[PDB]
Amino acid sequence: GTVNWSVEDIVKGINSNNLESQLQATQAARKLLSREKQPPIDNIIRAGLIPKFVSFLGKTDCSPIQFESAWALTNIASGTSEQTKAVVDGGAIPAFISLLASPHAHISEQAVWALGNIAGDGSAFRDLVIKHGAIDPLLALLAVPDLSTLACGYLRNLTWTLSNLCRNKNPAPPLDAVEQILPTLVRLLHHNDPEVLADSCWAISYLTDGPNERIEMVVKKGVVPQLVKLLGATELPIVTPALRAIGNIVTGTDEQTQKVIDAGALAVFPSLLTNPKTNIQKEATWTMSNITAGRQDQIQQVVNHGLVPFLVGVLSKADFKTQKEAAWAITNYTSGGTVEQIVYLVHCGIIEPLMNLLSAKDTKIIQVILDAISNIFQAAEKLGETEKLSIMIEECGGLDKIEALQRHENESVYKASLNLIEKYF
Amino acid sequence: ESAVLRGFLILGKEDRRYGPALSINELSNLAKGEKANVLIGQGDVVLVMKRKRDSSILTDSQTATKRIRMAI
């Protein structure tokens, strides 16, 4: 009955002086916008229908047309920034916030969804949704003693929308908004549904992506041990944001980094550093590089958890961008480590894979590796064992590599390589 | 000086794109992911970057910003 209408017929029905005709036409629009790819969003906008749909959101005495218009507007708002803007420009934000109070759960749910699409567009619309007062009624929908009593899809949609209110960092969400949302996020992080867990973790990954002051707000909520638990989940959609959040936290102070270590994060890294998902390996190695930029006692925890052989492994064989993260881990380790820690690193076999990467066509990893080599030689000087190290480097073809770099285009590279050769070879 | 500079990777000679040279004390307050020129003991200016490095923000692994509700 409402299947496969033309836009022209939809317009005719919506302009009729008959609320039932308007309802049927709005349902026809919903079906057009939901039964295909790609739905004719631009034709619907061009037809001038958004203001009508927004007016229907307020028809409390006709809940079916509230639902149909909410769904239609959700899908329009799911599109490009221009398409989402058309929805906002029609006055949809306060109309959707009012609809959060609907006694019909399927209607409140659709308003949640629509607000998530609007906030998802970017920081400006995110902050506009917050200014119109969305957070209080959204959080009130979750104010039940046991989240498990809520319909699963309903709870998933609420979690997703809250995560979009936490998303984007130019600028970051208002401090007061984050403070209001965080206690609910903490609760969702303990809810046993894989999508709720994934999207809660995403929210935390956004909130920790910024200055150390933003990291501190999250760490103070006590969530790091739960993040570490989720880091060991079997589902990749949970591990991915949990690892991003953990990685973000260790970009922070030595004290913030210590919370991650204290929570037992390092025990998960043998699996993360060998994960068959390339991006997991990359972010795990990035995370390790920021931990080895820490204190000597934090470097020692990396050693104690047996992670140095895993860094040797990644340096030996991984995607190049992951190898570059491993090289960063090694220059940071050798810059901050004790002589004993550095000796241990060489005994684990770091030299050959390190030297093999000096043929890379990447100036930064060359600078990083030459710095690492210089730091290792400085340790060797203190033990008076530089000749021992020179032989090791010569034997795996490393001296040929460094000798070539004397004619490298970049000044820092050929100066650094000239220096090593002049001093140790 | 040594203790401060341990937190940084020296990238090379002074690079004016990154502004006037900082003192070592000013450098110690540099934020993660940042670069700066620094005057080191004694007399030389070098370009450095902090060893704590910020997110790659891998768009490939990000989830969708928006969701369409399709017919079931």
From Swiss-Prot, chain A:
Similarity field = Belongs to the importin alpha family.
Location in the cell reads: Cytoplasm; Nucleus
Primary subcellular site in the record, as a coarse category: cytoplasm
Region (NLS binding site (minor)) residue ranges read 244-332
Gene source species: Mus musculus
Q: Looking at the record's lineage, which domain of life comes first?
A: Eukaryota
Any GO BP: protein import into nucleus
What does UniProt list as this organism's lineage? Eukaryota, Metazoa, Chordata, Craniata, Vertebrata
Keyword Protein transport annotated: yes
How does it get modified post-translation? Ubiquitinated. Deubiquitinated by USP22; leading to stabilization and increased activity.
Quoted from the entry, the domain comment is: Consists of an N-terminal hydrophilic region, a hydrophobic central region composed of 10 repeats, and a short hydrophilic C-terminus. The N-terminal hydrophilic region contains the importin beta binding domain (IBB domain), which is sufficient for binding importin beta and essential for nuclear protein import.
Which protein is depicted? Importin subunit alpha-1
Point out the coiled-coil segments of this chain: none
Q: Where are the ARM repeats?
A: 1-40, 41-80, 81-122, 129-173, 175-211, 212-251, 254-293, 296-338, 339-385, 386-425
Tissue-by-tissue expression: Slightly detected in brain but not in cerebellum and skeletal muscle, highly expressed in testis and spleen.
The record's subunit annotation is: Heterodimer; with KPNB1. Component of a complex containing CSE1L, RAN and KPNA2. Interacts directly with CSE1L. Interacts with PLAG1. Interacts with APEX1 (via N-terminus). Interacts with FRG1 (via N-terminus). Interacts with ARL4A, CTNNBL1 and NBN. Interacts with ANP32E. Interacts with SNAI1 (via zinc fingers). Interacts with SNAI2 (via zinc fingers). Interacts with BAG6. Interacts with AIFM2; this interaction likely mediates the translocation of AIFM2 into the nucleus upon oxidative stress. Interacts with RSL1D1.
Q: Which GO terms describe its molecular function?
A: DNA-binding transcription factor binding; nuclear import signal receptor activity
**Region (NLS binding site (major)) residue spans:** 71-167
Keywords assigned: Acetylation, Cytoplasm, Nucleus, Phosphoprotein, Protein transport, Repeat, Transport, Ubl conjugation
An example Gene Ontology CC term for this record = postsynaptic density
Full-sequence portion shown in this chain: 72 to 496 of 529
Curated annotation (Swiss-Prot), chain B:
Cysteine disulfide links:
none
Sequence motif: Nuclear localization signal, positions: 50-53
Give the subcellular location. Answer: Virion; Host nucleus; Host mitochondrion
Query: Which superkingdom heads the taxonomic lineage of this protein's source?
Result: Viruses
Family as reported in the entry's similarity comment? Belongs to the influenza viruses PB2 family.
Briefly state the protein's biological role.
Answer: Plays an essential role in transcription initiation and cap-stealing mechanism, in which cellular capped pre-mRNAs are used to generate primers for viral transcription. Recognizes and binds the 7-methylguanosine-containing cap of the target pre-RNA which is subsequently cleaved after 10-13 nucleotides by the viral protein PA. Plays a role in the initiation of the viral genome replication and modulates the activity of the ribonucleoprotein (RNP) complex.
Assembly behavior:
Influenza RNA polymerase is composed of three subunits: PB1, PB2 and PA. Interacts (via N-terminus) with PB1 (via C-terminus). Interacts with nucleoprotein NP (via N-terminus). Interacts (via N-terminus) with host MAVS (via N-terminus); this interaction inhibits host innate immune response.
Indicate what this protein is called per its UniProt record: Polymerase basic protein 2
* Species annotation: Influenza A virus (strain A/Victoria/3/1975 H3N2)
Span covered, complete protein: 687 to 758 of 759
